[PDB]
Amino acid sequence: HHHHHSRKTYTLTDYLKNTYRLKLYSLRWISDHEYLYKQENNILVFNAEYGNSSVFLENSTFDEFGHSINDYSISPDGQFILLEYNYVKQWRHSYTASYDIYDLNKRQLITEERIPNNTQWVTWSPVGHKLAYVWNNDIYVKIEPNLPSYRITWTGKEDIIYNGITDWVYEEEVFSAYSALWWSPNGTFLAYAQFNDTEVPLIEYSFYSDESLQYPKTVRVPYPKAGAVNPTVKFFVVNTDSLSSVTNATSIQITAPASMLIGDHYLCDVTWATQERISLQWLRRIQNYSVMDICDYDESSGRWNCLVARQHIEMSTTGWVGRFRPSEPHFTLDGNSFYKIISNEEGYRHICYFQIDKKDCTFITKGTWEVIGIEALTSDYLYYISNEYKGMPGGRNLYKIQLSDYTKVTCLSCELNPERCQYYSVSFSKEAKYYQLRCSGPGLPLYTLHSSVNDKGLRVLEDNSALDKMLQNVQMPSKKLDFIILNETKFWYQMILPPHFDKSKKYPLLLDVYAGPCSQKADTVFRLNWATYLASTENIIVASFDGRGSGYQGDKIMHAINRRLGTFEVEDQIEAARQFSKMGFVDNKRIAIWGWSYGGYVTSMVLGSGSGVFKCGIAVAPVSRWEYYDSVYTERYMGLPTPEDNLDHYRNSTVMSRAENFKQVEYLLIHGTADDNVHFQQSAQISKALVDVGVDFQAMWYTDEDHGIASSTAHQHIYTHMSHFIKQCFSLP
Amino acid sequence: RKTYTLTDYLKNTYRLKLYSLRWISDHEYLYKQENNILVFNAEYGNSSVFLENSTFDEFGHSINDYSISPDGQFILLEYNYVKQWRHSYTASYDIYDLNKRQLITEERIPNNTQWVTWSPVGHKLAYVWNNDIYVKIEPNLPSYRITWTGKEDIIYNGITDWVYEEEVFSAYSALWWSPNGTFLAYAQFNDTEVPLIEYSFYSDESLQYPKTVRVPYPKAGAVNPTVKFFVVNTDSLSSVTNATSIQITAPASMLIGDHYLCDVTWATQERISLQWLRRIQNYSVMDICDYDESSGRWNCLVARQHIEMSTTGWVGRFRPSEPHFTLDGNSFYKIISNEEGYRHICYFQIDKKDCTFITKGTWEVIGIEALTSDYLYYISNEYKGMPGGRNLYKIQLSDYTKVTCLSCELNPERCQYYSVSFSKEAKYYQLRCSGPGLPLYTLHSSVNDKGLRVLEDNSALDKMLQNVQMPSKKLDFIILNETKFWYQMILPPHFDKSKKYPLLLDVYAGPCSQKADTVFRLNWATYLASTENIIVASFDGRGSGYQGDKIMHAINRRLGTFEVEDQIEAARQFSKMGFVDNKRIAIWGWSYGGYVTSMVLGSGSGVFKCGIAVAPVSRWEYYDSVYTERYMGLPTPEDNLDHYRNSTVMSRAENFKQVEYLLIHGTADDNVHFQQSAQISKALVDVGVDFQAMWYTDEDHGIASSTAHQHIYTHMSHFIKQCFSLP
Ligand SMILES: CC(C)Cn1c(CN)c(-c2ccccc2)c2cc(OCC(N)=O)ccc2c1=O
Ligand SMILES: CC(C)Cn1c(CN)c(-c2ccccc2)c2cc(OCC(N)=O)ccc2c1=O
Ligand SMILES: *[C@@H]1O[C@H](CO)[C@@H](O)[C@H](O)[C@H]1NC(C)=O
Ligand SMILES: *[C@@H]1O[C@H](CO)[C@@H](O)[C@H](O)[C@H]1NC(C)=O
Ligand SMILES: *[C@@H]1O[C@H](CO)[C@@H](O)[C@H](O)[C@H]1NC(C)=O
Ligand SMILES: *[C@@H]1O[C@H](CO)[C@@H](O)[C@H](O)[C@H]1NC(C)=O
Ligand SMILES: *[C@@H]1O[C@H](CO)[C@@H](O)[C@H](O)[C@H]1NC(C)=O
Ligand SMILES: *[C@@H]1O[C@H](CO)[C@@H](O)[C@H](O)[C@H]1NC(C)=O
Ligand SMILES: *[C@@H]1O[C@H](CO)[C@@H](O)[C@H](O)[C@H]1NC(C)=O
Ligand SMILES: *[C@@H]1O[C@H](CO)[C@@H](O)[C@H](O)[C@H]1NC(C)=O
Ligand SMILES: *[C@@H]1O[C@H](CO)[C@@H](O)[C@H](O)[C@H]1NC(C)=O
Ligand SMILES: *[C@@H]1O[C@H](CO)[C@@H](O)[C@H](O)[C@H]1NC(C)=O
């Protein structure tokens, strides 16, 4: 006699076997009024205005073709389609793939001049159907798909010269992309970066591969660690309309400004402003000075010219510039003007309106909250996402600000579904006539289509009511999102609370940590993850806390950690644990802490801190010493590791040096052997240091797994392993 | 109450005294009175302080080892010790004139010397530096360069490459002086085409980018190193002209394919014996080469080639045995399998094919220790039919029937496991007895055979072990398929037949292994018995050694079968002994031991609750060519690929669902590569088996760093104590 009370829970197997599936609505705008979608492997074109769908491409159309199609890409005139197959992952964004090209208008694979195998990147012109692609580190161009490729570059060399693609560090840290190609708006020009890694040292690690490989492989990746020789970067614009079959193409270099060329620098942003105007942002290796150049094509010259009167300096007095890098500009149609997120005089990031010719801008938004990103710009309105609503830093809403009158701001998402939806992202149509809103929490994700013409609702695309239906008699956890005041400053935290939560009880508590610069682990987003399991099934509270260094709350918080990683942000997680147990429902004898990446670092520093607050912890792929991590990330916060910059704190902020203190706590240390990002080296050194002071601990390596330890089988194993470690630490049976 | 604790083991609370000596002549030996070195007289037991402690105070550096020239006139001081592989290292070397009492500063031996060695008589010095051989006729004089072809990782002159060091010569050096130092014989190895194993070395915290270590290492069926052998005449070296090295090419029977050099032994001043082994290691040949004055060359008459082959397995225990030549060099003695598979001393005439076996029986000769004009001295496990006992025996050469046991009766209760060290001409001998009682070192004259004196009785160690509740050892056999198989158990103190104890099967189980012996040991097993009241057992099943070929060759071409089945059957038989709690049976081992533990855990038998594998082989294609192929042939379709395929622990991953497993491996293991563990762990991950792991950054196969050795055993003890619900 159960009387239909919820006696199910969200179990480890539910998380690992993906029992409760979260439906999404993934679309691609092809025009200003139409988008593409995958119904049942079929591709439907959708009219957003009416709803009516014409089948664009039938599922069966290919794969008589004989390979598994990984992805596709329709030429922006809707006349061709790029078919991506033989997908082979590399780093976070990079990978190789075979490609073929199908002719929509005339129904046939292009059989001549095919894109070669092992193409590293491929891309259409924004208008028409010009193709640009890198192969063996060189850029090729095809004006028509079935015609021969024009070769733009000749200098590409594996692991040394990169034309049109990033190298390891630019990929992961600057452009969050493999592509270093940029077409001008009408496809006339192809901008590209060229990276030179000749002197960049190589990280080397064993790759064991299939048990068939008799001798392991040694992977060797150009990877600059803190203070090492960084790669150098050149930038070019070629004209794709004046290519020829009888003469190599002319690339026009645009050199970096005087102020950058004097030392180590980076290319950090490329952004076309018009058919003939492009903007570069350059950053010094010491990342507190950045210069935006704005370059015009000289018609008769055939060359590019960045006038020094249109240089714009962005610099930071209290830290580095940009959140992780300088914010990208959004130009007005004529390109005489642009909007850009920059920190205001009070430390809060806001939308500044710049004139191509004036130094001074005007902030069109302000307040003790921040703009997260500018999403769309029309002649009349600017669309952006901010955390202004109810002064909740971990919330997100779409707003439109009236270009002509900055006082007239309208929240587009806030009141749609206030209790279900406080975390929005948007997808605008080609010219912003329509938009999709993607609500992510605190309730179930909700996807919806909108006319910007009068900001009304067209339809609910996905309401996740299958999932809602499944969860009725599941004892799901609840989330609490709130703050505490330390030093007269709000600091936000979130608690995944076990079902039928009881403030009389004393629950064990897992502190889930990231805590890196500009991190936010305290938000209104809805998640079915490992933490959900622990709360629902194991009655553990999983909390996270955004203390000093965290993002989206202003520079006084974010920069507080500048030149000083492994200090306040570490200290604040320890205090977070105390504050929690001061709230009355936390078992002091059972407080764990865990984290991946920077989070692994913070966990490890916490456990080695000698605080006595934590019983145990798990570090996965942790950083152990900032001289081991990459330059562009690390130096951003740490400076250079040299006696005349900041070696002292590089040296003072290693988990190794705290080995002695681990005698006080139980430690699981996990790391994948093929981790190209946070090298296994880093954990290997933690282990050695612990061995040398006689502290026992738990360890697990993952053969051939990278930073995300994302293999299906490997993913299931680590979380299973961690669950055991946690369960036995907390005496859960 | 006090027991023998993990700390006691790890911090060596209870030390075992070694009376280690080195014979200087036929009636004198050196011994190191910690802060001193004495020459002792075997005759009278008196001494004279050979070398004062703080003579080399002045030196400045730490003196790792010393070495006296045969004629006593010089002493070679070794310092700057940099371990490499199991026997290999480099070091710096100074020479000290004793007749002068001053340290030689003239034409010194360079740093990073790979090997040094006095000639057997006089004071000549041959050393290897950057893989080339140098000789010094006098310590304070310019050295003559013998070889110019040496190249790092590629050409090894007078020193062995990785695989010959580990598996063939159990030594870094490949130089062999003739008896009176006239000739330097050496081998030359080519690794030009041997693939490299690569692994990361992380090094100290301050090294920003890990180093990648690369070592030429032939895994099963990979291209092997090639070898050439040379003899140079050190009495006729020129300062003007380059030294001239004569070559002894391998027999035609070996040159037809891949082969190995596996023994160099000088017979007389002008006679050298070489043993060569085919790559399929069941056919070896001995050459007997004589120097030719008139010709300047060496000659190995095909009519003096002695074949040693095997139809049932490989040849030799781990390699063909060494010959022991009568003084005139026209005859030699040698341990070979007889017609019934038991190994015994065969007496050979240089010109004649058939040897006469001089020992016989259902037991084995372990080794020939000394040969005189009238007696042959050997060690065997004959006494009381115990394969894991060792006793010294003299066999009268004029009448093979008159055999005396020199050590059997000395102390039968305390001593059943002996080794010997004879004087230069066999006039005296030192016995080491290593069990079952506390080790006991004695000095004996070989003329009347009396027992001059006790050298060390470990009476010190005896007095402390009264206070501690020590475990006992039971050594016995079970019968399978009408055949004896031996086991030992370390029984906890105050052992009660009526109680059910947890048991840990300690395994090696590799070919010619012997884990069931009368040796006394203070180890991890001692701790588990004394402190945690676990029974630690070992068992020598099929493929185990010193019990004849029938047993040893049982796993020929079939590694990962009978030796695995037999550890399980042992566990079964032990759990029918009534004092084994069979809800709590565990298995562990290192190397082969790890492989077998792993293979056993993946068997699905149901016998074992949990296990530990430390640096295990996971499949044989990952282990070196020489060891692996000796037992497994080649891993090709036309040979033994199928069984290589079937013998992997990865193929059994699914069965680990039934057991709790701990997999440990040092990341800088040159021998059994971490690869081997990485592939197991991956296999387990793919079938969803949870398990325990631990890597040891930059530890090699020993995991022998002070801290690392403590850390691993501690981790292992926690795992076992959790498995057995011991608090
Ligand atoms: C900023 C981007 C351009 C790149 N980037 C980087 C930098 N490589 C890191 C990171 C930070 C420190 C150490 C290694 C990696 C990172 C860490 C994350 O951790 C998740 C968590 N702990 O919950 C999630 C995302 C990111 C990421 O996107
Ligand atoms: C035979 C010699 C020429 C060299 N050798 C070798 C060969 N590499 C091995 C061994 C066997 C298989 C796999 C890896 C190593 C070995 C293993 C030992 O393990 C002891 C235990 N497990 O209790 C002890 C000694 C030895 C040894 O001396
Ligand atoms: C979609 O709907 C409209 C409604 O009038 C119709 O005219 C049209 O045929 C459909 N679109 C296309 C491209 O077929
Ligand atoms: C891709 O590879 C396959 C087989 O290796 C080949 O048949 C095919 O023609 C290749 N494609 C191109 C564009 O070269
Ligand atoms: C890359 O840089 C090196 C110097 O580090 C220089 O010699 C080389 O020419 C550069 N290569 C290219 C293609 O720019
Ligand atoms: C293009 O440049 C490469 C090398 O710079 C050269 O080999 C090739 O001949 C050039 N092509 C033309 C058309 O000049
Ligand atoms: C950048 O930071 C450096 C080192 O912290 C400092 O000396 C300087 O103030 C900054 N440079 C600029 C241009 O603001
Ligand atoms: C060997 O090294 C030491 C210290 O670096 C030095 O004193 C000596 O001169 C070196 N070389 C030789 C040829 O002895
Ligand atoms: C070593 O063998 C290689 C063939 O693999 C050959 O190049 C070289 O001549 C040989 N070296 C010596 C010293 O014999
Ligand atoms: C010896 O041989 C080497 C290498 O072949 C060469 O330098 C020279 O001809 C000789 N040198 C001496 C000292 O005899
Ligand atoms: C050592 O042996 C060689 C070779 O027979 C010989 O020339 C020399 O005389 C011998 N030494 C003595 C002391 O007889
Ligand atoms: C040596 O071994 C091979 C392969 O196992 C076998 O075919 C051959 O008969 C053996 N040779 C002898 C002489 O027993």
Q: Could you outline the blueprint of secondary structure elements for this entry?
A:
The structure is cut from a larger assembly and holds two copies of chain A.
Chain A: E1 8-9, H1 12-17, E2 28-29, E3 34-38, E4 43-47, E5 53-57, E6 71-74, E7 80-89, E8 95-103, E9 108-109, E10 121-124, E11 131-135, E12 138-142, E13 150-151, E14 161-163, H2 168-174, E15 181-183, E16 189-196, E17 202-207, E18 217-222, E19 232-239, E20 251-253, H3 258-261, E21 265-274, E22 277-284, E23 289-298, E24 303-306, E25 312-315, E26 330-331, E27 337-343, E28 349-355, E29 362-363, E30 371-377, E31 381-386, E32 397-402, E33 405-411, E34 424-428, E35 434-439, E36 446-451, E37 456-462, H4 465-470, E38 474-475, E39 478-486, E40 489-497, E41 507-513, H5 530-538, E42 541-545, H6 555-558, H7 568-582, E43 586-596, H8 598-607, E44 616-620, H9 631-638, H10 647-652, E45 666-672, H11 680-692, E46 698-702, H12 712-729
Parallel strand pairs in A: 1-38, 41-42, 41-43, 43-44, 44-45, 45-46
Antiparallel strand pairs in A: 2-3, 3-4, 4-5, 6-7, 7-8, 8-9, 10-11, 11-12, 12-13, 14-16, 15-16, 16-19, 17-18, 19-20, 21-22, 22-23, 23-24, 23-25, 26-27, 27-28, 28-29, 30-31, 31-32, 32-33, 34-35, 35-36, 36-37, 39-40, 40-42
The complex binds the ligand CC(C)Cn1c(CN)c(-c2ccccc2)c2cc(OCC(N)=O)ccc2c1=O (2 copies) and 2-acetamido-2-deoxy-beta-D-glucopyranose (10 copies).
GO molecular function, one term (chain B): signaling receptor binding
Main location (chain B): membrane
Subcellular location (chain B): Cell membrane; Apical cell membrane; Cell projection, Invadopodium membrane; Cell projection, Lamellipodium membrane
